[PDB]
Write a protein that binds this ligand. Structure first.
Ligand SMILES: [Mg+2]
Ligand SMILES: [Mg+2]
Length: 282
């Protein structure tokens, strides 16, 4: 379905224009980056056996994903301030996020996101396990503190939420419990959540995962497999529009739903204030 749409899109400008015509207005971008140790080996097939966070003269999947989404959403934020966080390194595990800059200062444009990313990466101790509760709660806090301005949180991760050892008997892990709770609670705010999967995964359980999130006032969650799209036999420009469309096509209807539900522009009042840790660098 997204492949059919993308056959008519040769540039990310066209995709931005389409989001606008579909009714997307002012949108702020929030980025969260997975810094788990698994990144070392999930690039087996998808990244020629290199770490997903390997730095070189060609962008790694994190840099690519940031670049495509950042470029596509740029038109919807006049000054492109991007709150950016890491999670899953030794300083945060599954409990916290850290801000890219001290005192939680926002990045000025995706270009600075990318530059700061490259500075931080070699200084991190990669760890785990995997929960998206902290990054989503951080996004919730930013949205509340902005007085209900519309935000898109983009999480780029190399694995599904950590499961229980006893998942076969229906047991959820605390990572799953807290992440699903956060997704549901986030739907009380004008916030869209896009989970971008990079690396080899596996990612086969994601559509079932999304299908099983409890009922919400609007569907505020999307998963997109960057790896699968970017592995296809298309021109580079057309793989990028397909990825941008698969990640962001559902954002204009979600935006319109936040207006219909009168979430836009107001404080919910029941959002605990998550504090981002400092970047574990120097
Ligand atoms: Mg991982
Ligand atoms: Mg702005």
């Amino acid at each position: 379905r997204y492949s059919k749409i993308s056959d008519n899109y040769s540039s990310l400008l066209q995709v931005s224009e389409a989001l606008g015509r579909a009714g997307l207005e002012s949108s702020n971008l929030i980025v969260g980056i997975d810094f788990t140790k698994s990144n070392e080996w999930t690039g087996a097939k998808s990244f020629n056996r290199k770490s997903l966070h390997h730095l070189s003269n060609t962008p790694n999947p994190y840099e690519q994903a940031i670049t495509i989404i950042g470029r596509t959403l740029a038109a919807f934020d006049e000054d492109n301030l991007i709150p950016c966080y890491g999670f899953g390194d030794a300083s945060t595990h599954d409990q916290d996020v850290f801000s890219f800059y001290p005192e939680g200062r926002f990045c000025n444009g995706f270009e600075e996101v990318l530059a700061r990313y490259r500075e931080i990466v070699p200084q991190l101790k990669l760890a785990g396990p995997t929960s998206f509760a902290p990054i989503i709660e951080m996004a919730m806090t930013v949205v509340e503190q902005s007085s209900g301005q519309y935000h898109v949180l983009v999480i780029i991760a190399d694995g599904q939420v950590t499961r229980s050892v006893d998942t076969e008997h229906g047991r959820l892990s605390p990572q799953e419990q807290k992440t699903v709770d956060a997704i549901v609670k986030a739907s009380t705010l004008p916030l869209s959540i896009v989970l971008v999967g990079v690396g080899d995964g596996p990612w086969d359980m994601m559509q079932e995962f999304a299908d099983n999130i409890p009922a919400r006032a609007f569907d505020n969650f999307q998963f997109v497999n960057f790896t699968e799209i970017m592995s296809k036999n298309k021109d580079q420009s057309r793989k990028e529009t397909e990825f941008a469309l698969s990640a962001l096509m559902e954002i204009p209807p979600q935006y319109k739903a936040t207006i219909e539900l009168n979430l836009l522009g107001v404080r919910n009042g029941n959002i605990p204030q998550r504090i981002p840790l400092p970047p574990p660098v120097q």
